[PDB]
RNA sequence: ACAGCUGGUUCCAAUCGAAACAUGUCGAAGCAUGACCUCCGCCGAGGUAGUCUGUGAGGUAGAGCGACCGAUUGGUCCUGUCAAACUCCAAACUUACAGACGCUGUUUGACGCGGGGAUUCCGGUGCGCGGGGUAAGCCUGUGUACCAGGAGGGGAACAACCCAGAGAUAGGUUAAGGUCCCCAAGUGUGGAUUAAGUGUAAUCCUCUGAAGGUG
RNA sequence: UUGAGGCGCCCAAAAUGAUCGGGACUCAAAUCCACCACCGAGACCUGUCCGUACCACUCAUACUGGUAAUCGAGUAGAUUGG
RNA sequence: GUUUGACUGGGGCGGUACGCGCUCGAAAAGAUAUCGAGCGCGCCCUAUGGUCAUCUCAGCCGGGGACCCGGCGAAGAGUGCAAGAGCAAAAGAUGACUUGACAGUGUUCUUCCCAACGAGGAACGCUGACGCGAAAGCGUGGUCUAGCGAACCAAUUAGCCUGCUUGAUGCGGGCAAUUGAUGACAGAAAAGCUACCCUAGGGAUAACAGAGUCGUCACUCGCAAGAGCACAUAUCGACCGAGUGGCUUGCUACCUCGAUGUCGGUUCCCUCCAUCCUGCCCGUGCAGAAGCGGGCAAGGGUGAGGUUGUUCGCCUAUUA
RNA sequence: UUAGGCGGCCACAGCGGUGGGGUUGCCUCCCGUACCCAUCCCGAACACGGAAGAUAAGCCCACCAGCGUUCCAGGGAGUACUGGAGUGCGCGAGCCUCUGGGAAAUCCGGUUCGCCGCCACC
C-alpha cells in the first residue's frame, strides 16, 4: 500500500490498545544502535535528522530508513565503530483499512505509524569529528525513505 | 472619542456584527458615528474592527464633517453655526465639536442624527480587504490617517 | 501529604473531635444544640446556635464555676453533671433560648451516663429537649447515692481533701434548691 | 426470590399495622354469562367472526407478582402493585 | 448520544477533583435561603440526595418557596419556565 | 372505483414572509403534534440581537504524566516515546443571572397571552470544527452565512467566490475589480529579480505538479 | 570553505485543433517592494416623483402639511384594495 | 378473501444502529447524525431491603498464601450486573433488631433540551400507620443512571352505585385498583412464487454509458541493499519513499428510467506514445556475426490462419 | 485560650523534624472498679469513681522547608492554542498578516510548618 493512504494527520489520535485489538507488531528491530553502552555526552559531534513537514511515518518506512542508515554506518565505521544512533520516535498511531462497500466502513487494523511534527528530531547520531561526513551520508540515505523533506542539523559541530 | 465608518457591506457579514453596527446607529455603507472611548464601547468597535474604519478625528476635521454631513434629528435643515446656536448648548460648530471630542455630550443628546452620512472617498480608499498596517483601510487609524478618509468623504 | 491526589480530612476530623456525619443530622432540626462535654476532672455544657463564620455560644456552664454557688465536692461526677446542666439551662432561659437538641459529640449514648444527666438538668431548667426518660439515671444515682454507698465500704476514705467522711448527697439537694430560687445572680 | 408467608404491614381497612398472610391469587372460574360471552354467541356467524376469530397471544419472559395480602385480625384482603420475579417461593 | 438517560455525558460535571473527594461540609447543606433570592445551581458530587437533572447545572434561579426541606427554585430553560426541587447542598448565593 | 403516485388548476396590486428540522406513526414518495410563517382580539411597561463588569457552570485546544491510567526504548539513578473512550494542569470560547452603556417599546403597544389560516418535515454550497472513507462533484454531524426564494457590478462563460442586498427617474462619487489592444481608464513612477513565454491562473471537480536534484 | 535567502531549470507521457478569455507581451503587458493618477455598480451622496408606515388636521381610509440614518429584493404561504 | 412490516451508501442475503443504559464520538453550558468506536439491559435479592450498634479496607512490612500481635496504609478494598460516577468514625465490614419493598394523595423534573406528546422513571412533600434510635434523624426498596407495556376482555381486592310499572330471587351493567402481552417494545390476528405477467411512478434508487475518485490496474521517478567469478549502476534489481495516466477493477450515486439499443465481430475514418518493425544515435559482460539495454523519433508498417460467441488467451507457419 | 469547648474555610492547615511548658488552676496521661454501663475474651475500649504520681506521649507554645501544597516574582512565552478578518503564501498538507484573548511543562528565587468566628477562663 502507498504512503498516500496514511501520511497525513487528518484522523483522530487512535492509540488506546485497551479498545483496539489485532495490532501488527512493529517491523522496527532496535531504536538504540552502535555502542549502546557509551554515553551521548562522550561525543564531540551530535548530528540530528530533522523532519520539515508534519507527517505520519509508518513502521515499515521507519525501519527501511533506519536500516539503510545504520547499514552505511556499519559499512564505513565497522560493526563496533565509535558511534551511537538513536531513533527517538515510536509508532503509536494505529492504522485502519476498509478492505461490503461503504456500509460498515470502519476498517480493520492493518498497521502502525509515528506522528512526527515539523521541526522534530527523528534520528540523532553522536560521533567523533573524523566520522562526521559518514553520518551525514547515513542520513542522506535515510531521508530518501521517509515522506517529508529533511534537514541534517549539526548540534555540537564547531569543527569545520 | 473615535469616529466609526462602515466600509464593508451587510451581505455575508455575521448577524452579531450587523446588530452591533445597528446599535452604534450605523445602518449603511459610508455612514459615520461618533463613539466615546469606554470599556463597553471599545468591546463594540473591536467586534466591528474588520468591517469598519476608526480613529480619533482632529478638531479641524470634525468641524468640516459636521458642517457638511450633520443633519437634525428630523429634516433637511443644514447644520451651520446659526443652526447650532439656536438649537444646541453651544455657540458655533467649534463649540459642539470640542464637546463631542471631550465626550461631554452626544449628537442625539443635542437633537442631531447620530449618523453623519458621508460621500464615497474622493480618489478612493486604500482597500477593504486589508488593515491599515498592511496598506488597506480597515481597522484603527492615525489621527492624521482618519482625517484623510473623513476629508475625502466630505 | 503524598502528592496532589491525596485527600487530607477536614481539620476537626484529623483532630478526631467532630463526627461530621452526626453533626449534619443534629443541625437538621433547626433547634440550638445542647453541647454536652466531659473531661476527667470537669464537665462542660453549652447552648450552641449556627452562625455565619462559625458556631455561636449563647449560654454555657462549666463545673468549675459551680463552686461560685456553694459546691465543695469534686467536679467530674454524676451530681456535678446534672447541676452543670441545670446551670446551663438557666442561663439559656435568660438568653431567650427555649428549645434544644442534645449533642453528646464523640461520647457513647450509654444509659444513665453523665451526658444524659447534663440533659436531665437542662430539661428541669425549663428547656424543651427531645429525650427518653428510661435512658436517664434513676433520681438517686443523679443525687449521688452510688458514691455515698461506696464510702460505706470504707476502711480508708474515698476523698483525700477534707469535704466530709460518709459524703453528703444532701449538698446536691441544697444546690438544686439554690439554683431553683428566683433570685440568684446567674 | 424468597418471601415470608406472614409479616407485619399496613391494613388500609383497619387503618393500623397488623400481621398479614400472603397467598398467590388463584384464578376464579368463568360463568359464561357475562356480556362478552353473549356477544360471542350473538356476533358469530358465517365466515370470519372478527375479534372472536383471534387466538390468545404469547408470554413475557418473566411475569409480575400476583399476590393477595390477607389481614390477620379483620380477615379482609388488599392488593399491591407487583414486581417482576422469575420464581416466588414462600418461607414457612 | 448512544442513550437518552439522565447521567448521559456527565463524567465531568458529576465528579469531584481528587482533593474535593469524600463527605462535604454540613454548613452549606443546612443553609437557609429566603424567597426571591437568586441562587446558583451546581450539584455537589459527594451529596447523593436532593439533586436535580444535570442539564440544569450552571443555572441561576430564583427561590420561590420550599417543599419540605428542599427548595422550589424557579429557572428559565431556554424560553420555558421550570420549577426545580433542590436541597441547599447544591445551592450557593448570588453575589 | 380507490391511490400517500405523475400532470394540470385561468385577472392586477400592496404588507409580512418561511420550513427543508424535532416527537409519534405498518412510518420513511404520507400524516399528526411541535419548531417556524401570517392574521385577529387581549394585556399594559418594560425588552435584551452587542459590549463591559460582577456572581456562577465547563474539561475541548494546548500541555503533561516519580499526577492516576494504559501504552511504549536501552544501559550499567540514568536514558527514548505516546493517548477519542488518560488527567497534577489548562485556555480561546460557549453558557445562567444581574448591573451599566447601547439599541428598543409605552398614538409605530414592545415583552407577553389567547384564538383563526397556513406552508413545511427530498435541501444544497462556502467557511470553521468535525466523525467515517485511499479518495470522491462521497457519506453523516455541528456553528455560521449564503443558494434555494437574491437583482445589479466583477470573475471569459458559471445557484451559492469577491462587491453589493434592489421603488421610478436623473446628476455625481466610489466598491469589487481593472488602466497595451480587444475594452472604460497608465504602454504611469522609483528600484530589483526572472530568460523559463517561467509567468500574465485569489477561491476551484475546474487553476496541478511531488520526492529527489541544480557552479 | 561553509551557512541562508530570491527567481528560474530538471524531475514532467494521451488520445479531433495549442493556449493566460484571445491578441500578443521580455530594463514587461511577468515577479517582488514602494509610490502617483485614473477607469469602474442599481452601492454612497444628491434633485423630483411613487408606494407603504406613522404624526397633525378631519367624519374621511377625502384634502393639506409633516417624519422615515434607524421604510421599499423574495419561492411556499397568511393578509388586504382593485 | 387476504396477509406476508420497517431500517438499509438501490434491493436481497447478513445484520437490528426497531424499546432501554454507560464511555468516546460531541467541537470545556444545552442539543447533536452515520450499518460510528468500546459494551451492556429485558433480572437477581426477605436480604443482597430498613434502622441502630460496633468497626475499617486492599497491598506491603516485622513477630509467631490458614489464624494471632504490631507497624505503614485517603481508598488501590468493598458496594448483585455494563460503563462512567459516589462513598471511610461510611454508602464498605460485622452484629442485632425490623418489614417504609407500607396505604392514600400530590408538587416537580424526566420521558420529549429548547418546544407540544402517553406508558414508564426519578426527585421532593403531605395524610395515615409503622420500624429503628437516647435523639436530632433515617426508612416513599437495592448509592446513581438499564431491568419495560394502551384500549377491549378475563381473573382478582374492598365498599358502594345500578338493570325499562312493582316486590322477591337469579344472573347481569358500573365507580377504584392489582395481575394476564403486544421485543415491529406510543400495541394489525398474517407465508411464498411469477421468465405468463399488469399498473402507478422514480434517475428520490440499481444494471449499461457518462461523470468524480484511484484503493485496484498500467507506467515512471527517488534511494540503491543485493548479484552480476572482482566489480550496484553491461544487465538484473529488493525494501522504503515520490508520482503520472484514466486501458482494468472497485467505490460514489452527480446525469438519463414520458428509453442516449447489448457483448463480440465486421466495415470506414481520425488520433495518442508509454515505440513491436523501419531511420538516426549511446552503452555493452561491444572481436566479428547474432544480441542485450538505453536515447531521439508517431512518416510508413504491424499481415494469414486452427479451437473458442468470446474480449482475453492458447496454438501454427510465414514476417523487417 | 499558663495548656479549654463548639466551629468556619477544609493541605497556606499535609508528611517529617528540633526546642520549651505546668503544686491546691486547665487539658492530659495517670490511679482504681461498689455502683450506671461495658467487652461474641479482656474496666484495653466503652462507662463510672478519684488524685498517689508525671510533663515522658498528647495537647498548648516557639521554630526548621527536606517532601506534598497555596500564592507571587523573574525566565520559558506573548511561545502553544484561539474568537474575528484577508483576491496574503503554499501542488498540497499547511502557513502568514491584522485584530481581540492567552496557556502548560520545567528552571531560579520568594511564600506557606494555618487563617478566622463564638464562648469560657489570672
Ligand atoms: Cl467530651
Ligand atoms: Cl406471584
Ligand atoms: Cl430537575
Ligand atoms: Cl436585504
Ligand atoms: Cl509565447
Ligand atoms: Cl388598484
Ligand atoms: K435511460
Ligand atoms: Mg432624518
Ligand atoms: Mg475616480
Ligand atoms: Mg481595492
Ligand atoms: Mg467530556
Ligand atoms: Mg397578485
Ligand atoms: Mg397597491
Ligand atoms: Mg490534546
Ligand atoms: Mg425551492
Ligand atoms: Mg481603452
Ligand atoms: Mg503556463
Ligand atoms: Mg376487499
Ligand atoms: Mg425498503
Ligand atoms: Mg420512543
Ligand atoms: Mg455538551
Ligand atoms: Mg386486543
Ligand atoms: Mg387474574
Ligand atoms: Mg415504535
Ligand atoms: Mg411499470
Ligand atoms: Mg440520481
Ligand atoms: Mg519517449
Ligand atoms: Mg501517425
Ligand atoms: Mg477466421
Ligand atoms: Mg515536653
Ligand atoms: Mg492555493
Ligand atoms: Na453487505
Ligand atoms: Na342479534
Ligand atoms: Na467534598
Ligand atoms: Na388505493
Ligand atoms: Na418520517
Ligand atoms: Na407515502
Ligand atoms: Na487544534
Ligand atoms: Na438596560
Ligand atoms: Na428533512
Ligand atoms: Na438571503
Ligand atoms: Na458575469
Ligand atoms: Na506561456
Ligand atoms: Na408570494
Ligand atoms: Na405486517
Ligand atoms: Na409521567
Ligand atoms: Na398476472
Ligand atoms: Na493520478
Ligand atoms: Na472508473
Ligand atoms: Na459491436
Ligand atoms: Na511512426
Ligand atoms: Na483465434
Ligand atoms: Na461465634
Ligand atoms: Na506534655
Ligand atoms: Sr478527515
Ligand atoms: Sr523524502
Ligand atoms: Sr347476529
Ligand atoms: Sr364461524
Ligand atoms: Sr417470549
Ligand atoms: Sr459547545
Ligand atoms: Sr509602464
Ligand atoms: Sr520597474
Ligand atoms: Sr469537468
Ligand atoms: Sr492550486
Ligand atoms: Sr524540490
Ligand atoms: Sr514525447
Ligand atoms: Sr418595492
Ligand atoms: Sr416587499
Ligand atoms: Sr398475493
Ligand atoms: Sr450494493
Ligand atoms: Sr437512595
Ligand atoms: Sr321485571
Ligand atoms: Sr419459504
Ligand atoms: Sr423458463
Ligand atoms: Sr529501432
Ligand atoms: Sr475456420
Ligand atoms: Sr472486456
Ligand atoms: Sr481464458
Ligand atoms: Sr485502669
Ligand atoms: Sr502531493
Ligand atoms: Sr494582556
Amino acid at each position: 500500500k502507498p504512503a498516500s493512504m496514511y501520511r497525513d494527520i487528518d484522523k483522530p489520535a487512535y492509540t488506546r490498545r485497551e479498545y483496539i485489538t489485532g495490532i501488527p507488531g512493529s517491523k522496527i528491530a532496535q531504536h538504540k544502535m552502535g555502542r549502546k553502552q557509551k554515553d551521548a555526552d562522550d561525543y564531540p559531534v551530535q548530528i540530528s535528522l530533522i523532519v520539515e513537514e508534519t507527517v505520519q511515518l509508518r513502521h515499515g518506512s521507519l525501519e527501511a530508513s533506519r536500516l539503510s542508515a545504520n547499514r552505511h554506518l556499519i559499512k564505513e565505521l565497522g560493526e563496533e565503530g565509535d558511534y551511537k544512533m538513536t531513533l527517538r520516535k515510536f509508532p503509536h498511531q494505529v492504522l485502519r483499512e476498509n478492505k461490503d462497500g461503504m456500509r460498515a466502513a470502519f476498517g480493520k487494523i492493518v498497521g502502525t505509524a509515528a506522528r512526527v511534527q515539523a521541526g522534530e528530531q527523528l534520528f540523532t547520531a553522536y560521533c567523533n569529528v573524523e566520522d562526521a561526513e559518514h553520518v551525514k551520508e547515513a542520513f542522506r540515505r535515510a531521508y530518501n525513505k521517509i515522506t517529508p523533506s529533511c534537514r541534517i542539523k549539526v548540534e555540537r559541530g564547531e569543527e569545520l | 472619542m473615535h469616529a466609526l465608518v462602515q466600509l464593508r457591506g451587510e451581505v455575508n457579514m455575521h448577524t452579531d456584527i450587523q446588530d452591533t453596527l445597528e446599535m452604534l446607529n450605523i445602518h449603511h455603507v459610508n455612514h459615520c458615528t461618533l463613539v466615546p472611548e469606554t470599556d463597553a464601547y471599545r468591546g463594540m468597535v473591536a467586534k466591528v474592527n474588520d468591517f469598519v474604519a476608526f480613529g480619533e478625528p482632529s478638531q479641524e476635521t470634525l468641524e468640516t464633517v459636521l458642517a457638511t454631513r450633520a443633519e437634525p434629528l428630523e429634516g433637511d435643515a443644514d447644520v451651520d453655526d446659526e443652526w447650532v446656536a439656536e438649537h444646541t448648548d453651544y455657540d458655533d460648530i467649534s463649540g459642539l465639536a470640542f464637546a463631542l471630542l471631550s465626550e461631554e455630550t452626544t449628537l442625539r443628546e443635542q437633537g442631531l442624527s447620530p449618523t453623519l452620512r458621508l460621500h464615497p472617498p474622493r480618489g478612493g480608499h486604500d482597500g477593504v480587504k486589508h488593515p491599515v498596517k498592511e496598506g488597506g483601510q480597515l481597522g484603527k487609524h492615525d489621527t492624521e490617517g482618519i482625517d484623510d478618509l473623513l476629508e475625502a468623504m466630505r | 501529604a503524598t502528592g496532589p491526589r491525596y485527600k487530607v480530612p477536614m481539620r476537626r476530623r484529623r483532630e478526631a473531635r467532630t463526627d461530621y456525619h452526626q453533626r449534619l443530622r443534629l443541625l437538621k432540626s433547626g433547634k440550638p444544640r445542647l453541647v454536652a462535654r466531659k473531661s476527667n476532672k470537669h464537665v462542660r455544657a453549652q447552648l450552641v446556635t449556627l452562625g455565619p463564620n462559625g458556631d455561636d455560644t449563647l449560654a454555657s456552664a462549666h463545673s468549675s464555676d459551680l463552686a461560685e454557688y456553694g459546691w465543695e465536692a469534686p467536679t467530674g461526677n454524676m451530681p456535678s453533671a446534672y447541676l452543670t446542666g441545670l446551670l446551663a439551662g438557666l442561663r439559656a432561659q435568660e438568653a431567650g433560648v427555649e428549645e434544644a437538641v442534645l449533642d453528646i459529640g464523640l461520647n457513647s449514648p450509654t444509659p444513665g451516663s453523665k451526658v444524659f444527666a447534663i440533659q436531665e438538668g437542662a430539661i428541669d431548667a425549663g428547656l424543651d429537649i427531645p429525650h427518653n426518660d428510661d435512658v436517664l439515671a434513676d433520681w438517686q444515682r443523679t443525687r449521688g447515692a452510688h458514691i455515698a454507698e461506696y464510702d460505706e465500704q470504707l476502711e480508708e476514705p474515698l476523698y483525700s481533701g477534707d469535704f466530709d467522711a460518709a459524703d453528703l448527697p444532701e449538698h446536691f439537694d441544697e444546690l438544686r434548691e439554690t439554683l431553683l430560687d428566683g433570685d440568684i445572680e446567674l | 426470590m424468597q418471601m415470608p408467608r406472614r409479616f407485619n404491614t399496613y391494613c388500609p381497612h383497619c387503618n393500623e399495622h397488623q400481621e398479614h398472610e400472603v397467598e398467590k391469587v388463584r384464578s376464579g372460574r368463568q360463568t359464561g354469562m357475562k356480556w362478552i360471552d353473549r356477544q360471542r354467541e350473538r356476533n358469530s356467524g358465517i365466515g370470519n367472526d372478527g375479534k372472536f376469530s383471534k387466538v390468545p397471544g404469547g408470554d413475557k419472559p418473566t411475569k409480575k407478582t400476583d399476590l393477595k395480602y390477607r389481614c390477620g385480625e379483620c380477615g379482609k384482603a388488599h392488593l399491591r402493585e407487583g414486581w417482576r420475579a422469575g420464581r416466588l417461593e414462600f418461607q414457612e | 448520544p448512544s442513550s437518552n438517560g439522565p447521567l448521559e455525558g456527565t463524567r465531568g460535571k458529576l465528579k469531584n477533583k481528587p482533593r474535593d473527594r469524600g463527605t462535604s461540609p454540613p454548613q452549606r447543606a443546612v443553609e437557609e435561603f429566603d424567597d426571591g433570592e437568586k441562587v446558583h445551581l451546581k450539584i455537589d458530587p459527594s451529596v447523593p440526595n436532593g439533586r436535580f437533572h444535570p442539564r440544569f447545572d450552571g443555572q441561576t434561579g430564583t427561590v420561590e418557596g420550599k417543599q419540605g426541606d428542599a427548595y422550589k427554585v424557579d429557572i428559565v430553560d431556554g424560553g420555558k419556565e421550570k420549577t426545580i426541587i433542590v436541597t441547599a447542598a447544591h445551592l450557593r448565593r448570588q453575589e
Side-chain angles (χ1 to χ4, degrees):
Chain A
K1 295 301 167 176
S4 51
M5 293 172 73
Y6 310 108
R7 62 189 174 205
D8 309 275
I9 308 205
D10 39 39
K11 281 202 187 306
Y14 192 57
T15 70
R16 307 292 306 278
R17 302 197 177 219
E18 40 266 81
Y19 311 115
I20 309 162
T21 72
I23 309 160
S26 188
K27 285 182 186 179
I28 300 169
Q30 13 91 68
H31 289 71
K32 313 288 177 176
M33 290 152 284
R35 288 182 180 225
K36 55 167 191 179
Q37 290 196 58
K38 207 173 178 188
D39 288 39
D41 299 288
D42 295 7
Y43 291 94
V45 182
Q46 174 191 127
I47 312 177
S48 306
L49 184 66
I50 288 167
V51 160
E52 289 184 295
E53 301 174 323
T54 301
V55 281
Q56 283 201 329
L57 312 171
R58 291 192 290 183
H59 65 344
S61 286
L62 250 15
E63 169 63 39
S65 65
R66 199 227 69 224
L67 204 63
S68 72
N70 201 232
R71 221 196 280 120
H72 187 65
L73 283 169
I74 274 173
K75 190 200 172 188
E76 299 291 320
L77 317 195
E79 293 172 282
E80 262 179 282
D82 211 64
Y83 75 98
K84 62 182 290 73
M85 189 164 81
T86 323
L87 169 54
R88 42 220 302 177
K89 293 301 170 198
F90 282 77
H92 295 294
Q93 180 77 12
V94 187
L95 312 167
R96 320 177 203 113
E97 195 190 339
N98 191 52
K99 62 216 294 182
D100 188 47
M102 274 302 282
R103 157 177 290 165
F106 199 93
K108 59 165 289 163
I109 283 75
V110 298
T112 40
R115 290 194 163 175
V116 187
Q117 301 295 304
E120 286 207 288
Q121 306 175 70
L122 182 67
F123 286 108
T124 304
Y126 313 89
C127 75
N128 293 282
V129 193
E130 48 165 51
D131 296 336
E133 297 304 304
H134 288 298
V135 69
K136 280 188 178 185
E137 187 63 0
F139 286 169
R140 197 229 62 196
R141 289 197 185 194
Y143 74 43
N144 269 304
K145 295 191 178 181
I146 48 170
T147 295
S149 294
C150 305
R151 285 173 191 138
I152 290 172
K153 190 185 173 185
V154 197
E155 266 109 3
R156 300 185 200 192
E158 286 283 278
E159 286 87 274
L160 182 60
Chain B
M1 187 280 251
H2 289 157
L4 274 199
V5 184
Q6 186 166 354
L7 285 186
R8 289 178 80 193
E10 56 157 17
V11 197
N12 296 311
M13 175 160 89
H14 285 290
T15 317
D16 61 351
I17 295 181
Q18 171 103 76
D19 287 309
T20 301
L21 280 168
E22 294 190 67
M23 276 169 226
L24 295 176
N25 307 294
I26 171 165
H27 302 74
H28 307 330
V29 168
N30 295 342
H31 273 211
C32 173
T33 175
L34 306 180
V35 47
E37 293 178 53
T38 321
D39 287 353
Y41 271 124
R42 226 161 52 236
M44 286 192 254
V45 308
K47 191 176 185 62
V48 186
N49 192 274
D50 314 284
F51 300 91
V52 88
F54 65 102
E56 184 179 18
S58 60
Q59 181 83 56
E60 295 194 47
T61 313
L62 187 62
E63 277 173 26
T64 308
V65 171
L66 280 177
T68 182
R69 298 301 167 179
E71 294 178 300
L73 215 48
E74 271 174 50
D76 283 286
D78 300 352
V79 183
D80 44 36
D81 294 310
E82 206 190 338
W83 192 91
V84 177
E86 294 163 0
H87 297 271
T88 332
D89 296 349
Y90 308 96
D91 295 336
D92 50 338
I93 293 171
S94 295
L96 177 60
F98 177 70
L100 292 164
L101 280 175
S102 57
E103 299 169 18
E104 202 66 66
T105 195
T106 54
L107 296 172
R108 180 177 290 231
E109 258 189 44
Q110 299 307 134
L112 283 166
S113 176
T115 311
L116 316 169
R117 318 185 283 90
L118 319 180
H119 183 86
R122 293 162 188 73
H125 52 219
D126 301 328
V128 283
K129 296 196 168 308
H130 297 286
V132 196
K133 291 190 176 185
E134 270 187 1
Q137 204 89 51
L138 309 167
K140 194 163 182 172
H141 291 232
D142 240 346
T143 299
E144 202 233 322
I146 232 296
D147 288 354
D148 295 3
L149 188 62
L150 286 177
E151 273 162 43
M153 294 208 278
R154 250 174 287 119
Chain C
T2 315
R5 295 199 74 176
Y6 194 88
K7 161 71 178 45
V8 171
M10 287 185 266
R11 205 201 74 232
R12 300 206 93 220
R13 176 60 202 107
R14 310 172 203 147
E15 290 175 22
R17 291 189 154 283
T18 310
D19 190 301
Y20 278 104
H21 264 277
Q22 194 196 50
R23 188 175 196 256
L24 179 58
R25 275 144 35 199
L26 243 356
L27 296 181
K28 270 180 184 170
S29 52
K31 296 180 178 182
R33 293 183 300 141
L34 173 66
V35 179
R37 304 295 153 159
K38 34 152 283 197
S39 179
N40 290 293
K41 283 189 179 185
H42 292 285
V43 152
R44 173 110 61 182
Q46 302 165 298
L47 255 308
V48 175
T49 207
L50 218 51
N53 304 255
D55 281 331
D56 286 358
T57 302
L58 296 79
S60 70
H62 194 270
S63 58
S64 61
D65 60 81
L66 196 61
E68 194 189 296
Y69 297 94
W71 207 242
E72 209 183 307
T75 49
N77 50 36
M78 285 287 288
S80 189
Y82 174 99
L83 289 161
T84 303
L86 182 66
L87 190 47
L90 288 168
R91 277 161 177 153
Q93 282 278 256
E94 264 298 298
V97 176
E98 288 180 90
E99 47 195 37
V101 260
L102 186 75
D103 185 304
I104 64 167
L106 286 162
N107 288 104
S108 293
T110 303
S113 301
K114 289 191 278 177
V115 279
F116 278 143
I118 291 172
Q119 191 196 35
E120 190 174 16
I123 288 160
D124 289 3
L127 242 50
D128 300 305
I129 308 135
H131 59 283
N132 193 273
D133 287 310
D134 50 276
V135 88
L136 306 172
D138 65 285
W139 195 240
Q140 287 305 302
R141 195 197 156 85
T142 317
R143 228 183 67 132
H146 60 304
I147 195 179
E149 285 174 54
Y150 189 40
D151 203 280
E152 203 76 85
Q153 299 177 71
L154 200 55
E155 192 187 67
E156 284 166 51
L158 178 56
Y159 289 171
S160 181
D162 201 65
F163 171 43
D164 47 29
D167 296 332
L168 295 164
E170 276 83 42
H171 204 137
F172 173 89
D173 293 84
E174 281 171 355
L175 212 74
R176 188 198 137 113
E177 183 79 271
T178 316
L179 297 175
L180 252 57
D181 180 46
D183 287 64
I184 206 154
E185 309 161 283
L186 291 165
Chain D
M1 61 171 288
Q2 314 268 115
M3 169 148 243
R5 177 74 64 190
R6 296 164 198 283
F7 68 98
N8 291 268
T9 192
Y10 193 70
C11 165
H13 306 295
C14 294
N15 233 259
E16 60 191 279
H17 268 52
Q18 234 78 84
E19 195 222 38
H20 291 56
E21 185 230 288
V22 207
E23 185 200 1
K24 280 175 174 174
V25 189
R26 279 253 201 72
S27 303
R29 232 177 183 168
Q30 286 193 222
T31 51
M33 279 182 265
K34 269 70 191 60
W35 170 77
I36 195 66
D37 301 300
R38 274 180 282 156
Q39 204 198 16
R40 188 159 199 201
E41 287 182 66
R42 273 198 304 286
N43 288 4
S44 295
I46 302 164
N48 189 73
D49 297 318
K51 68 171 284 178
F52 303 113
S53 281
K54 298 176 175 177
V55 290
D59 287 335
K60 204 69 179 166
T62 294
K63 307 277 174 175
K64 275 169 176 167
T65 269
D66 192 12
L67 299 170
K68 258 183 201 187
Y69 296 79
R70 288 241 144 252
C71 173
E73 196 184 79
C74 71
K76 296 183 177 189
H78 74 261
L79 298 164
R80 288 188 181 183
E81 188 191 301
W83 64 93
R84 292 178 157 86
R87 203 203 298 140
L88 187 66
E89 287 179 279
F90 293 98
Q91 300 192 316
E92 286 181 60
Chain E
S2 58
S3 52
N4 209 50
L7 311 190
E8 173 269 325
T10 64
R11 196 208 274 229
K13 60 169 70 170
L14 301 193
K15 178 186 63 196
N16 266 139
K17 252 73 181 188
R19 269 192 68 178
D20 293 69
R21 209 218 304 144
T23 320
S24 290
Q27 184 94 314
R28 58 173 171 215
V30 216
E31 191 66 71
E32 298 294 327
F33 302 98
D34 306 273
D35 294 10
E37 276 204 76
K38 295 272 188 172
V39 291
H40 285 119
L41 276 76
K42 168 76 212 89
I43 289 168
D44 192 318
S46 311
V47 187
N49 284 318
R51 294 176 180 230
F52 46 84
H53 194 290
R55 199 176 269 148
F56 306 124
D57 234 44
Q59 278 284 323
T60 314
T62 304
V63 176
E64 286 292 358
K66 59 162 65 201
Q67 195 167 290
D69 285 336
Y71 289 90
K72 292 197 275 177
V73 183
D74 282 6
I75 62 124
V76 169
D77 187 356
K80 188 172 188 182
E81 299 183 352
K82 285 174 189 177
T83 314
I84 296 171
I85 313 289
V86 55
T87 51
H90 311 277
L91 298 172
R92 310 295 291 167
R93 253 179 214 91
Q94 192 176 45
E95 246 63 63

